[PDB]
Design a protein around this ligand. Structure first.
Ligand code: MET
Lengths: 335, 339
């Protein structure tokens, strides 16, 4: 019943990029109080919105740009360019501001207006594309832009760039150390797939039997072999299988309905006080569905939370009001 | 170019989100400090309170107010929490109430911070929306009515007069002390409740003689300096009165900062250091740069509090002006006042 807040970090950080990563792992309790989830089963959420720009992509924009500069692929005189669903452009704006490079962006018009609003203040340059066409339309927008041109642009290429995936070797080490090697299952909702694959490949170097679970929208279940379809889980469901995706590293794929992802997110902020985004609601409902399986009794389940509900205020995330008690709401999610 | 390394694993599993409050990072500024009148020796650091789980310094305050009340019995099963607030304190109370299992009632004018309304409601709060024309005093009047009519039912957070607000910042002070290895010379804090500036001064003045403590307030509403209350646009500070928890003896100097400068400074910080701080952080940073230019402060370590981040200000005019000028023109225009 005693509660201790966080101790001093005992570091002076040399710039904001050094504050990326080392995100906290937090036990869920409110949404896990359910007669089928057994007491020894631990459900932990890794809160990637503790990154300075509040999303998992901070690690991505940082590693892509910093390696490209160390590489020679980004050099003084070039600009950065990319297509995103939002968070990646914001992470590249952060790295761009620190390193001193200009940044240009293409993104679907349908993504929350909060995302559009962050880019620019840092020093970027935007282009909003058609919703309907989704991430592929953004990508085409980007190709257009480079086509011509010189050897002037470095293209971040977040769906095909292995520096995306490799940034999540740190994510995996943090899960390993924070759980003292006890993690059994990791659940990650998939956009670029750099988190699920980067985490999986680094954790399999640690312990072979860790189960890795990808999550995607039921309405666009492309990893499971379905076609691209309209969905509302912002930040995931790219509509294609990213070139960095490595299926041999993923044990199971869970489809989650858009409405259910949102409703889970509603429940997590109400019963645990954790303000997770839409794709977090998908990941957490998948993880809860794992936690009620009798073969997972006593296991440690780690669920990636990629973003904060506050970047979604303009959406319908917090529109509908759920009826029922806590137990009613959880029953409706699990059945 | 230096090796940049990211943060190491926390090596902790947190029992709930309130355990992730505090231990906020202290970060060097470089881009906005590159001006001839600031010396290569002096260290200008920002403590980023938006690393709290709800992205502001008030997480500490909502947590400690509710925690301390539970511990000493001012808050007991059955009662509900209430506060009149349209800002971060409201969010911070909702967070704490969500985890502790207590209902949270937040009163504010129906027309203020409807984004912040939504956040509060998402956390399960009852919002008490009062008449628009009446401003904050109408919210306070409603909370006064509700507590008068329901004796014993509510616990009033009372952020401007609660010593548990100031006391939470002994932790802030300790983080400053350990993170600088005792080298901190000056702390700059923009003042809302004054919990931060006083609670940090109380504890640091115990560590070492000679730590200068600087309060920052809007030039247009310089009530700590004894001017009259006035309209200003630096959200989160300039409450219009001297808060009950303010202790003037612990504050060495007060710096007035104009609203438009506070905004322009916040824009420069995100552009040149890539740190997306909020409006009151633009005020405190500009005050701190003005310190770093004083010849007597050469080689000193200056710590500036950054209470919130720019994402909570997207519907304001914070990022509407697009400043013309290269970096050096902008910093020179921000530091150029005489006296
Ligand atoms: C919808 S596919 C994943 C795109 C990624 N969420 C980005 O921030 O750009």
């Amino acid at each position: 019943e005693q509660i201790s807040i966080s101790s001093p970090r005992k570091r002076i950080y040399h710039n904001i990029l050094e504050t990326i990563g080392g995100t906290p792992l937090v036990e869920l309790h409110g949404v896990t109080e359910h007669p089928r989830i057994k007491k020894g089963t631990r459900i932990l959420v890794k809160l990637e919105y503790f990154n300075p720009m509040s999303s998992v992509k901070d690690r991505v924009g940082f590693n892509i740009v910093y390696q490209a500069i160390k590489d020679g692929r980004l050099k003084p005189g070039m600009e950065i360019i990319e297509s995103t669903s939002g968070n990646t452009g914001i992470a590249l704006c952060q790295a761009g501001a620190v390193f001193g490079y200009r940044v240009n962006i293409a993104m679907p018009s349908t993504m929350s207006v909060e995302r559009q609003m962050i880019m620019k203040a840092f020093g970027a340059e935007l282009i909003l594309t058609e919703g309907k066409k989704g991430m592929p339309g953004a990508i085409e927008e980007v190709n257009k832009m480079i086509k011509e041109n010189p050897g002037k642009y470095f293209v971040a290429n977040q769906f095909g760039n292995p520096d995306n995936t490799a940034a999540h070797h740190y994510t995996a080490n943090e899960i390993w150390e924070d759980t003292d090697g006890e993690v059994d299952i990791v659940v990650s909702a998939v956009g670029t797939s750099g988190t699920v694959i980067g985490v999986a490949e680094k954790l399999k170097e640690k312990k072979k039997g860790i189960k890795i679970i990808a999550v995607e929208p039921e309405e666009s279940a492309v990893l499971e072999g379905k076609a691209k379809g309209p969905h509302g889980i912002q930040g995931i469901g790219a509509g294609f299988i990213p070139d960095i995706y490595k299926k041999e590293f993923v044990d199971e794929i869970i489809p989650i309905k858009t409405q259910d992802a949102w409703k889970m997110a509603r429940a997590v902020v109400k019963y645990d006080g954790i303000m997770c985004g839409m794709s977090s609601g998908a990941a957490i409902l998948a993880g809860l569905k794992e936690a009620e399986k009798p073969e997972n009794e006593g296991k440690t389940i780690v669920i990636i939370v990629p973003s904060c509900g506050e970047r979604y205020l303009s959406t319908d995330l917090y529109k509908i009001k759920d009826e029922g008690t806590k137990i009613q709401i959880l029953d409706s999610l699990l059945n």
